[PDB]
Symmetry: D2
Subunit: 116 residues, 4 copies
């Protein structure tokens, strides 16, 4: 139930109150499970008061190409956490109780694991 995540973030975001653009990918394959799917989350980290990452996501499942029209779901998720680089880095979880641990690199690298 743990999967690899990888992404990128804007390592030098504007300072005017704007959020920090980011994204990441998870393919839903590990040593035990393979769902023949991948999700991508696109959003922004917003710091300050309490910290949050607001995303929209796309989940694509491998399909025959006569079923390709029904292959992609869309949704939104909001993550709360338990310098863009230090603010993103850590442990986050969502509404449904999924969890992800991220490390934000100085170069714009995002790396970690997503737990379902």
């Amino acid at each position: 139930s743990r999967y690899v995540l990888t992404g990128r973030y804007d390592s030098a975001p504007a300072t005017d109150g704007s959020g920090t653009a980011l994204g990441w990918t998870v393919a839903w394959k590990n040593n035990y499970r393979n769902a023949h799917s991948a999700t991508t989350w696109s959003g922004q980290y917003v710091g300050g008061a309490e910290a949050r990452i607001n995303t929209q996501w796309l989940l694509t499942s491998g399909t025959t190409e006569a079923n390709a029209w029904k292959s992609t779901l869309v949704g939104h998720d909001t993550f709360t956490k338990v310098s863009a680089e230090a603010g993103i880095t850590g442990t986050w979880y969502n509404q449904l109780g999924s969890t992800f641990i991220v490390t934000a690199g100085a170069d714009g690298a995002l790396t970690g694991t997503y737990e379902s």
Copy 2:
């Protein structure tokens, strides 16, 4: 105008005809520009005589909380893998995701796929 791309793919997909699910992300900051934005593509590789990656994408820009409703664009794209040249003996590309891919509008990306599911490359606008 090259930027770092990174992603994941199903390295053990169905052999039933289904394509191979994948995703990747690009942040629009390199050594010389920063557009305070990132794009993620979600889709699948479909192989054969003419290998293609059919995608849907989301582009999010950094915004204030008040402009957050207009932070995210959505769209679609298809990438085709470059094939050997007729002068070399032509033919369809080697099976696999690793390679050079282009879209309709002139963007190109070069990618290396890992045996485990990793994807890393460079995207040129």
Copy 3:
């Protein structure tokens, strides 16, 4: 700030407790302004003590060909149905789509629903 809305809904919903699918469109053109854009909301009504409509939306603006790629926004929204005031006796709203709905941001709509699936109303930003 008031705009015409038109849409459709499933007037014979499932009864295993699923929601009621609907969708609607607002073109951002009225007497007073014109933003050369249209939004469609796709989502479901969930009846209940607190009646809600949960949507995802697409906002498209007219563009030239070279800018088509940046023409559509995507987002999501939840609307909640106005209920009677406590002074009137309170209680939850009577079932149905017909009524007044607000989002968290202060935008409001008034719709009338047809017995056979039609939706019509007025959207106010």
Copy 4:
């Protein structure tokens, strides 16, 4: 297999060679079938000899609370044609073979039927 559609278009679009914003909804219920779901198409009309309507769509199916995160699909459709009012009005078809007949009103109305 015919359904009622209705929508809106910008009835005074820009004059700069820009396309015309529009959108419509179909609920997949009729006298004969009911799939408990609705599609909305958002996009634009591009006029000319080989005129087209380019869209992105959202299909939402009625789900239980629990299932909600997986209720909505996204995709895209391109229609060809078999004054935006004079232009949109008519019969159109897309890749999948679906067809729609639509009347554009002077007011910005779209009404008609969709056949899938």
